Amino acid sequence: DKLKEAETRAEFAERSVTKLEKSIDDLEDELYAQKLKYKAISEELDHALNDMTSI
Amino acid sequence: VTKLEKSIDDLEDELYAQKLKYKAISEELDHALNDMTSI
């Protein structure tokens, strides 16, 4: 009896971990996409502040 | 822009200097053409 209970709950904990792991990979990927989409606009920036201080 | 603005002020100033350095030689001129037509 202790068994049916330990196993059923293990299955629910595993379903919840795979759900949360799937949501961590989407946020961490949406991420390097944001973190990188920036190095580009902040670098396009030191550049686009340097040429008008020069022109 | 700061480079070209600096070059516009130097040319515009070199300018009123040229434009004025002349009124003087063109006026020294109507004069220095009139006396030899007279002599």
Which resolution in angstroms does this entry have?
35.0
Helix (H) or strand (E) holding A19: helix A2-55
Contact between residue B7 and residue A55 where contact means Cβ atoms under 8 Å apart: no
Q: What is the CA radius of gyration of chain A?
A: 24
Residues of B with Cβ-Cβ distance to A48 under 8 angstroms: none
How far apart CA A24 and CA A44 sit, in angstroms, is 30
Would you call B3 an interface residue with chain A, using a CB distance cutoff of 8 Å? yes
* Burial state string for A14-41 with b = 16 or more CB within 10 A and e = fewer than 16: eeeeeeeeeeeeeeeeeeeeeeeeeeee
CB–CB of A54 and B3 under 8 A?
A: yes
Report residue A33 as tokens.
Answer: 């996409």
- DSSP class of B2: H
- All residues of chain A having their beta carbon less than 8 Å from the beta carbon of residue B2 are 52-55
What residues of A are in contact with residue B3 (Cβ under 8 Å)? Answer: 54-55
Q: What are phi and psi of B15, to 5 degrees?
A: -65, -55
Q: At A42, which amino acid appears? A: S
Which positions ≥6 away from A55 have C-beta within 8 Å? B1, B2, B3, B4
Q: What is d(CA A34, CA A40) in angstroms, rounded to the nearest whole number?
A: 10
